[PDB]
């Protein structure tokens, strides 16, 4: 036995640790800020990787592999780990482990691009990167080493590069919403939060109700011609004039797994959406001592064969030395979306008993109907997980008009949607003021408190003219989404 | 235009550089010993990765991801890169970048394994590793950073672990011989060349005729209980006695791509076996100015659709601004195994002209027969590439009886197969003596010269009794394969 015992709504940090440890998703490691990704989590990564990989291939993006090292000269042209020695011997100049690969890839782009016939150039890589913050890590969400993909494209015009930025952002919306059943908000980052050196940064943002925090889920940047100028990346049109290329950068990490875990989990542990579950259906035979155990197990194998013909991912837990109750809890903790139970009474009726992980509802299904009924049940579970999560997202955002509605909203663990003048100085003033007010409240009470922009959403509600900015009183420009954050 | 101009049989090093650069497989990089893997090579890696990944999954191996860092304490429990600083700040203790992950994974294994019901434990990861030799690199073959997979299993008995070692070695034989059409020899490493800390190391070895050198293609180790003792990895049987587990480690790298390139390439450039070619068939329309170009291109699209229904990977090069001659050479350099040409005379007859890359032989195929004929042609090209390579392997090995047949054989750029007493001191004496004799010959002549064991092959020819060892005159034990090497 091993059950989750912290409650998700009472001690959220302990609950999250129990849910990912007791389900065997992660293991700790002697170097702080790094975690081991065990197969139960890694299978989910492989599934979303396959999804995204297939979609970018349809766009003409190709995979590649660039070195993990970058020279001091190129990098600084900051949370970076430096290699200064090979064995006993001092490197003649220190080299960094990649935090991101713009400065690794771009010198090569400048060599490869000569003519408009070389554009567009579209590359991606799957690798890990290192960002060495000396603050406390969170499994999946903030770690010193993490797996990601990063794509990098170059175009003859700004408009084509922007079109690609938005197409990729839509793929990230599908990664979260269609595979992981996590609702996200598309938007533009503020000038203070956009990618250093870029022109415009787009994002999809997620929300964690139990601590009130927004979290950036993935990112797609219009670099414009800024990096082209730094690295001298130019092409000749068909008339022979040299022009800078226009570039994009975009990435998504194993952070997505953590967001999925927090979104769907419950007091019993993980709940994995059917579309990414490596086991969608666990078959548990009931194995009384005084029964025809061979016949029961034979029928479980037949059912498995039948379900796999419909591309359902099935595992039979025929372990003799554990009870069905033990098995129920074991696969509940691991988040398997459907359990199928089969005992001598079911065999006698030609049915199976099926229990859905999200709600506990049980069904009796004839064997003839099993494959289509289970297909529709998984699609219902997927949809239900998304819709419930989406309603929590919408309950979690307060539309406000002025600044002293902020702290009450933040104390409800909500995000705020507010008209903003988008002046860069005001974002830093707001972060400092909300941090300060959070400190005072902590002292009245017996993990940063600051509120920052999460994004300026693509979906703008009506902006009546004359609407003033909630903090400066200046004319508002757009509705901006703010909250505490990761 | 861009043609290979160094001849493979005259300046092999220049030829190999031209073949991988002009085909856009690799790009140089500012940190020596590291190379960029561009898509044309990376697609081949993805193909063999998919092959091997599917086969180990059938064995119950699961993928995982362990950190790239290892603490000094665990590592030293040597060509290793040390991180000693994050930004400006000194790490309290230096940490190494993984050269291999036994010391990273094994502490976790000791935590995870408790009972015989936890065995066997079978994990793999796809990642890169760093081995920081300060000698001159060779693209694909010997580099400071390379991609690989490494698998690690633990078993309740030696016999099961050995059975797994040999099953994996057979997968590596299939990786080389069935995907890459490269012949390899299975064998056991000598006691001096086996994995440090292991019990027995098995290998598949390849041979490069143009420089006479053997090269280890992949490796599968019986670690036995040695690492179990170091890391205290124990299980309880069903009677409650603690026993050490028995372990295996195995890996294969992007070195395989380089071996494939050297094996099949010719004076025109790369030749890629059909089973791993990302483009198997390139369709080149003939586009005379005074022709119905629309009809020709329409038929090329129809042919492409028809071939892809048979799972043939097809690209149409309909570029207007290059000649067919230019295109022929461009895709020859890149190693595409089949070219299909279509002009107005072919359209008028309902045929296409097909040219095979390995031999230059051309065929006229009716459109109705195209899919099955091309399928059989690709299988013939694959087989032909393997069989020709296998005959070069067999021409390259001399069976000898005594030591002064060694240097003449080595001067023919051959490997030698010799009866050996398998005493460890004699291997080091032989390496020093052959190195010395090679130096003298270099001075008479106007990249190490030493001969070492490559492996003790599983396929042993007859050993008449009384046969003495070719170097010590002591009783021979087994036939051993020796040569200059990478
Ligand atoms: C997994 C992951 C994911 C992400 N991000 C960044 C945005 C992005 C998105 N979308 C990417 C990269 C895809 C574009 C994403 O996924 C960032 C980090 C990270 O910043 N790690 C360092 C670290 C270690 C650490 F121990 C602690 C902290 C730490 C503690 N408190 N604070 C304030 C920081 C930070 N890590
Ligand atoms: C790609 C790759 C592959 C391999 N191996 C090793 C065996 C194996 C097999 N089978 C593995 C790892 C799978 C088990 C394989 O693939 C080794 C190296 C390597 O040793 N790199 C360091 C280096 C850098 C460098 F610039 C120069 C040298 C150098 C120059 N002269 N000499 C004598 C060395 C070495 N690299
Ligand atoms: O780190 C980032 O945010 C961008 C997107 C992936 C590559 N660099
Ligand atoms: O480096 C090696 O040879 C073994 C096999 C892969 C992991 N370690």
How does DSSP assign A265-316, residue by residue?
A: -BTTB----TTT-S-SEEEEE---TTS-HHHHHHHHHHHHHHHHHTT--EEE
A378 lies within 8 A of chain B by CB: no
A421 Cα: distance to centroid of ligand 1 (angstroms) = 28
Assigned token pair, B26: 């690799």
Cβ count within 10 A of residue A452? 19
B74 lies within 8 A of chain A by CB: yes
Residues 6+ apart with CB under 8 A from B111: A27
Q: In angstroms, rounded to a whole number, what is the distance separating the alpha carbons of residues A346 and A353? A: 8
Using an 8 Å Cβ cutoff, are A402 and A197 in contact?
Answer: no
Q: In angstroms, rounded to a whole number, what is the distance separating the alpha carbons of residues B419 and B424? A: 14
User: Which residues from A are below 8 Å from B108, CB to CB?
Assistant: 27, 29, 36
Assigned token pair, B431: 């390496």
Residue A297 CB-density burial (10 A; 0-12 exposed, 13-18 middle, 19+ buried): middle
Q: Beta A246-253 vs A145-155: how paired, if at all?
A: antiparallel
Cβ count within 10 A of residue A48? 21
Best CA proximity match to B77, nearest among B297, B284, B232: B232
Over the Cα atoms of chain A, what is R_g? 26
- Residue in B closest to A122 by C-alpha: B39
Q: In angstroms, rounded to a whole number, what is the distance separating the alpha carbons of residues A63 and B230? A: 39
Residue A50 CB-density burial (10 A; 0-12 exposed, 13-18 middle, 19+ buried): exposed
Using an 8 Å Cβ cutoff, are B122 and B60 in contact?
Answer: yes
Beta strand spans in B131-174 (E): 145-155
To the nearest 10°, report the CA torsion of B8, B9, B11, B12.
60
Backbone angles phi, psi at A431, to 5 degrees: -55, -45
Question: What Å distances lie between residue A31 and A35, A143, B73, B94, CA to CA?
Answer: 8, 11, 11, 11
Question: What Å distances lie between residue A147 and A31, A100, A377, A380, B264, CA to CA?
Answer: 17, 11, 32, 31, 35
Ligand nearest to the CA of A249: 3
Q: In angstroms, rounded to a whole number, what is the distance separating the alpha carbons of residues A111 and A100? A: 20
The experimental resolution of this structure, in angstroms, equals 1.8
Best CA proximity match to B353, nearest among B284, B429, B446: B284
- Name the helix (H) or strand (E) containing B315: strand B314-316
Go through A4-42 and write b for each residue having 16 or more CB atoms within 10 A of its CB, e for each that does not: beeebeeebeebbbbbbbbbebbbebebebbbbbbbbbb
Degrees to nearest 5, angle at CA A86 with A81 and A88? 120
Using an 8 Å Cβ cutoff, are A353 and A338 in contact?
Answer: no
Cβ count within 10 A of residue A1? 9
Best CA proximity match to A34, nearest among B70, B74, B83, B67: B67
State yes or no: cis peptide before B120, omega within 30 of 0: yes
Q: In angstroms, rounded to a whole number, what is the distance separating the alpha carbons of residues A173 and A219? A: 10
Assigned token pair, B292: 């119905």
Go through A299-309 and write b for each residue having 16 or more CB atoms within 10 A of its CB, e for each that does not: bbeebbeebee
- Name the helix (H) or strand (E) containing B246: strand B246-253
Helix locations, B198-320, DSSP H:
226-231, 255-264, 293-309
Assigned token pair, A196: 């250093």
State yes or no: cis peptide before B164, omega within 30 of 0: no
Assigned token pair, A280: 């969608």
**Could you give the 3-state DSSP secondary structure of residue B187?**
strand
CATH architecture of B274-379: 3-Layer(aba) Sandwich (3.40)
- Residue in A closest to B121 by C-alpha: A39
Contact yes or no for A87 and B84 at CB 8 A? no
Q: Is B257 close to ligand 2, i.e. is its CB under 6 Å away?
A: no
Go through A227-258 and write b for each residue having 16 or more CB atoms within 10 A of its CB, e for each that does not: bbeebebbbeeeeeeeebbbbbbbbbbbbbbb
For residue A217, give the ligand 1 atom closest to its CA: 10
A320 lies within 8 A of chain B by CB: no
Over the Cα atoms of chain B, what is R_g? 26
Beta strand spans in B406-465 (E): 415-420, 452-457
Per-domain residue ranges for chain B? 1-273, 274-379, 397-485
Q: In angstroms, rounded to a whole number, what is the distance separating the alpha carbons of residues A416 and A400? A: 7
Could you say which of 3.30.930.10, 3.30.300.130, 3.40.50.300, 3.50.50.60 is the CATH number of the domain covering B1-273? 3.30.930.10
Q: In angstroms, rounded to a whole number, what is the distance separating the alpha carbons of residues B245 and B199? A: 13
Best CA proximity match to A75, nearest among A59, A95, A47, A54: A95
Q: In angstroms, rounded to a whole number, what is the distance separating the alpha carbons of residues B280 and B275? A: 8
- Residue in A closest to B42 by C-alpha: A64
- Which residues does residue B344 pair with via DSSP β-bridges, in sequence order? none
Per-residue DSSP letter, B367: G
Residues 6+ apart with CB under 8 A from A144: A31, A32, A33, A34, A130, A131, A132, A133, A137
Degrees to nearest 5, angle at CA A477 with A473 and A478? 115
Assigned token pair, A142: 């903030």
Using an 8 Å Cβ cutoff, are A363 and A353 in contact?
Answer: yes
Per-residue DSSP letter, A38: -
- Residue in B closest to A322 by C-alpha: B117
Best CA proximity match to A454, nearest among A397, A395, A408, A391: A397
Looking up tokens 């494959």 gives A371
Q: In angstroms, rounded to a whole number, what is the distance separating the alpha carbons of residues A44 and B478? A: 48
Mutate to test the pocket of ligand 4, among B251, B252, B254 (most ligand atoms within 8 A of CB): B251
CATH architecture of B397-485: 2-Layer Sandwich (3.30)
Q: DSSP string of B43-108?
A: HHHHHHHHHHHHHHHHTT-EE-B--SEEEHHHH-----EEEEEETTEEEEEEEEEPSSSHHHHHHH
- Which residues does residue B215 pair with via DSSP β-bridges, in sequence order? B206
Assigned token pair, A446: 């017996």
CB proximity under 8 Å: B 208-267 to A: none
Q: In angstroms, rounded to a whole number, what is the distance separating the alpha carbons of residues A401 and A417? A: 9
User: Which residues from A are below 8 Å from B73, CB to CB?
Assistant: 30
Contact yes or no for A39 and B95 at CB 8 A? no
Q: Pick A42's closest partner by Cβ from B37, B63, B132.
A: B63
Residues in chain A: 486
To the nearest 10°, report the CA torsion of A172, A174, A179, A183.
90
Go through A375-407 and write b for each residue having 16 or more CB atoms within 10 A of its CB, e for each that does not: bebbeebbeebbeebeeebeebbbebeebeebb
A46 lies within 8 A of chain B by CB: yes
B454 Cα: distance to centroid of ligand 2 (angstroms) = 15
Using an 8 Å Cβ cutoff, are B360 and B329 in contact?
Answer: no
User: Which residues from A are below 8 Å from B67, CB to CB?
Assistant: 29, 31, 34-36, 145
Question: What Å distances lie between residue B22 and A460, A484, B270, CA to CA?
Answer: 51, 52, 10
The separation between CA B53 and the C-alpha centre of its own chain, rounded to angstroms, equals 15
Cβ count within 10 A of residue A408? 12
User: Which residues from A are below 8 Å from B97, CB to CB?
Assistant: 83, 97
| CA pseudo-torsion sign B227, B232, B233, B236 | positive
Using an 8 Å Cβ cutoff, are B152 and B249 in contact?
Answer: yes
Assigned token pair, B285: 């329309």
Helix locations, B274-404, DSSP H:
293-309, 324-333, 344-349, 370-395
Experimental technique for the deposited model: X-ray
Q: In angstroms, rounded to a whole number, what is the distance separating the alpha carbons of residues A191 and B13? A: 52
Largest Cα separation within chain A, whole Å, is: 87
Using an 8 Å Cβ cutoff, are B452 and B431 in contact?
Answer: yes
Using an 8 Å Cβ cutoff, are B129 and B145 in contact?
Answer: yes
Assigned token pair, A398: 């307060």
Residues 6+ apart with CB under 8 A from A85: A91, B81, B82, B84, B94
Binding-site residue set of B for Ca(2+): 163, 167
Shortest distance between the Cα of B291 and any Cα of chain A, in A, equals: 25
Residue B51 CB-density burial (10 A; 0-12 exposed, 13-18 middle, 19+ buried): middle
- Name the helix (H) or strand (E) containing B478: strand B478-483
Using an 8 Å Cβ cutoff, are A339 and A284 in contact?
Answer: yes
B32 lies within 8 A of chain A by CB: no
Per-residue DSSP letter, A128: E
Go through A355-373 and write b for each residue having 16 or more CB atoms within 10 A of its CB, e for each that does not: bbbbeeeeeebebeebbee
Using an 8 Å Cβ cutoff, are B170 and B154 in contact?
Answer: no
Backbone angles phi, psi at A116, to 5 degrees: -55, -25
Backbone angles phi, psi at A246, to 5 degrees: -115, 130
Q: In angstroms, rounded to a whole number, what is the distance separating the alpha carbons of residues A121 and A62? A: 9
Question: What Å distances lie between residue A108 and A105, B34, B37, B38, CA to CA?
Answer: 6, 13, 11, 10
- Name the helix (H) or strand (E) containing B464: none
Contact yes or no for B87 and A132 at CB 8 A? yes
Q: Whose CA is nearest to atom 10 of ligand 2?
A: B218
The separation between CA B145 and the C-alpha centre of its own chain, rounded to angstroms, equals 15
The separation between CA B270 and the C-alpha centre of its own chain, rounded to angstroms, equals 16
Binding-site residue set of A for Ca(2+): 163, 167
Do the domains A1-273 and A397-485 sit in the same CATH topology, yes or no? no
Assigned token pair, A168: 């990729």
A311 lies within 8 A of chain B by CB: no
| CA pseudo-torsion sign B71, B72, B78, B81 | positive
Per-residue DSSP letter, A404: G
Looking up tokens 């095979």 gives B356
Assigned token pair, A172: 């990230």
Beta strand spans in A119-197 (E): 121-130, 145-155, 185-188
């Amino acid at each position: 036995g091993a059950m989750v015992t912290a409650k998700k709504d009472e001690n959220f940090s302990e609950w999250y640790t129990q849910a990912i440890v007791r389900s065997e998703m992660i293991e700790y490691y002697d170097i702080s800020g790094c975690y081991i990704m065990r197969p139960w989590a890694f299978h989910i990564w492989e599934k979303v990787q396959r999804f995204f990989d297939d979609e970018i291939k349809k766009m003409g993006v190709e995979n590649s592999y660039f070195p993990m090292f970058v020279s001091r000269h190129k990098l600084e042209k900051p949370e970076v780990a430096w290699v200064t020695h090979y064995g006993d011997s001092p490197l003649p100049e220190k080299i960094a482990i990649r935090p991101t690969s713009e400065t690794i890839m771009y010198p090569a782009y400048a060599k490869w691009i000569r003519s408009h016939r070389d554009l567009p150039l579209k590359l991606n890589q799957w690798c890990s990167v290192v960002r060495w913050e000396f603050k406390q890590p969170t499994p999946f969400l903030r770690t010193r080493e993490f797996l990601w993909q990063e794509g990098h494209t170059a175009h003859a015009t700004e408009e084509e590069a922007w079109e690609l930025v938005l197409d990729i952002l839509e793929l990230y919306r599908r990664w979260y919403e269609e595979c992981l059943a996590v609702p996200v908000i598309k938007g533009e980052k503020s000038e203070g939060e956009k990618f250093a050196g870029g022109k415009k940064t787009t994002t999809v943002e997620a929300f964690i109700p139990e601590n009130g925090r927004g979290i950036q889920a993935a990112t797609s940047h219009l670099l414009g011609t800024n990096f082209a100028k730094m690295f001298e990346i130019e092409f000749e049109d068909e008339e022979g004039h040299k022009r800078l290329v226009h570039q994009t950068s975009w990435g998504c990490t194993t952070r997505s797994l953590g967001v999925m875990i927090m979104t769907h989990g419950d007091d019993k542990g993980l709940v994995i959406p059917p579309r990414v579950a490596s086991v969608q259906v666990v078959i548990i035979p009931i194995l009384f001592k005084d029964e025809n155990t061979g016949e029961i197990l034979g029928k479980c194998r037949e059912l498995k064969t039948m379900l796999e013909k419909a591309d359902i991912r099935v595992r039979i837990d025929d372990r003799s030395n554990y009870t069905p109750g033990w098995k129920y809890n074991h696969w509940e903790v691991k988040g398997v979306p459907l359990r199928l139970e089969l005992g001598p009474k079911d065999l006698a009726k030609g049915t199976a008993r099926v229990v859905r992980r999200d709600t506990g509802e049980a069904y009796q299904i004839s064997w003839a109907d099993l494959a289509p009924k289970l297909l529709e049940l998984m699609e219902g579970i997927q949809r239900s997980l998304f819709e419930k999560a989406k309603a929590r997202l919408h309950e979690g955002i307060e539309k406000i008009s002025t600044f002293d509605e902020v702290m009450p909203a933040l104390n409800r663990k909500h995000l705020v949607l507010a008209p903003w003048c988008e002046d860069p100085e005001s974002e830093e003033q707001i972060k400092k003021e909300t941090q300060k007010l959070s400190e005072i409240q902590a002292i009245e009470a017996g993990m940063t408190g600051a509120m920052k922009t999460l994004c300026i959403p693509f979906d703008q509600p009506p902006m009546p003219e004359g609407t003033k900015c909630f903090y400066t009183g200046k004319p508002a420009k757009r509705w901006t989404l703010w909250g505490r954050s990761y």
